[PDB]
Write a protein that binds this DNA or RNA. Structure first.
Ligand code: NA
Ligand code: NA
Ligand code: NA
Ligand code: NA
Length: 327
DNA sequence: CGGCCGTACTG
DNA sequence: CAGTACG
DNA sequence: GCCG
């Protein structure tokens, strides 16, 4: 953790976010990787060639780094559309993405007041706007613990054998957490079927859950619950809660997926692809058949992965503690 | 030229 | 399906 | 945007 180029990545992140909200996701992914490189790196970049030498940084990006050091600014930033700040504001409503934000902007909306009174909102967006400020805040990990304990307690209350674990940034050892990721499974391998009903209707008794964003409860094969909860007592804020229930055989891949980070998973899955293998939150497969565009055309076969170490091993990668998975 | 991860809900 | 979301 |  030593940002030796904050002054540059600072101006780049602004541009990356602008491209993201406008919907230019690949260009944004490009900047996102170059930005991290310039951070993870060990000294202030002082040359056009030091830069190029850095993975994730090409000529085009190096040139821009130059401008920041020689000129102190980036003329590219002085031509960003005036719509960006508004698109970013609209895009921060849970449930609304680049497409919805661009539409609202097109319709003449410029503020949350406009959205609240004139915009047509999906059930999810109404909930997101309702907790707009709350969904932008991170929580002390200590509170994440209380939330994971509240979920786990209600789960083991009707089946003491249930294994509950908090993943995400929590397991990666961060000081604060954006939301709480709770993974639930069962050692026997069957008793995890159709438990969402009991867990969710148990957490609703005690009034712990306040809003539901994603919860397909009419289906017995529900895999995830994305919602909102709030601990009891004064001074509590609404927090995002994400729960997944998986079969014990998929426990390791699930744990690995849910622990992240997101960029870490993508990188790992990208490696598996170069090796004709495939990785998901369900399993690690080998002998996968893909076409010219890297799209799966053949299923291949699932490899036994009892633990996270097995996944790294099978991929010919040295294991990495959760805390060492921020990218 | 063209992929850039592989999934799960919603309506 | 497109959109949005999860890590 | 980067990279193979
Ligand atoms: Na350009
Ligand atoms: Na959003
Ligand atoms: Na999280
Ligand atoms: Na539902």
């Amino acid at each position: 953790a030593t940002n030796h180029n904050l002054h540059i990545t600072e101006k780049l992140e602004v541009l990356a976010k602008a491209y993201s909200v406008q919907g230019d996701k690949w260009r944004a992914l490009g900047y996102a990787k170059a930005i991290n490189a310039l951070k993870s790196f060990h000294k202030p970049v002082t040359s056009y060639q030091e830069a190029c030498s850095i993975p994730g940084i090409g000529k085009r990006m190096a040139e821009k780094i130059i401008e920041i050091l020689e000129s102190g600014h980036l003329r590219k930033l002085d031509h960003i559309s005036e719509s960006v700040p508004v698109l970013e504001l609209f895009s921060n409503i849970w449930g609304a993405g680049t497409k919805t934000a661009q539409m609202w902007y097109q319709q003449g909306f410029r503020s949350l007041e406009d959205i609240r009174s004139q915009a047509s909102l999906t059930t999810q967006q109404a909930i997101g706007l309702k907790h707009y400020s709350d969904f932008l805040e991170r929580m002390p990990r200590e509170e994440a613990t209380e939330i994971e304990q509240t979920v786990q307690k209600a789960a083991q209350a009707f089946n003491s054998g249930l294994l509950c674990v908090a993943c995400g940034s929590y397991r990666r050892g961060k000081a604060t957490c954006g939301d709480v990721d709770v993974l639930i499974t069962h050692p026997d391998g069957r008793s995890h079927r159709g438990i969402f009903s009991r867990l969710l209707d148990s957490l609703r008794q005690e009034g712990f859950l306040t809003d539901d964003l994603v919860s397909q409860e009419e289906n017995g094969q529900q895999q995830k619950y994305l919602g909102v909860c709030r601990l009891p007592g004064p001074g509590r804020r609404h927090r995002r809660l994400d729960i997944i229930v998986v079969p014990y055989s998929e426990f390791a891949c699930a744990l690995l997926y849910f622990t992240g980070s997101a960029h870490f998973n993508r990188s790992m899955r990208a490696l598996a692809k170069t090796k004709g293998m495939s990785l998901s939150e369900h399993a690690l497969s080998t002998a996968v058949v893909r076409n010219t565009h890297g799209a799966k055309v053949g299923p291949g076969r699932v490899l036994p992965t009892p633990t996270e170490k097995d996944v790294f091993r099978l991929l010919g990668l040295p294991y990495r503690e959760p805390a060492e998975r921020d990218w």
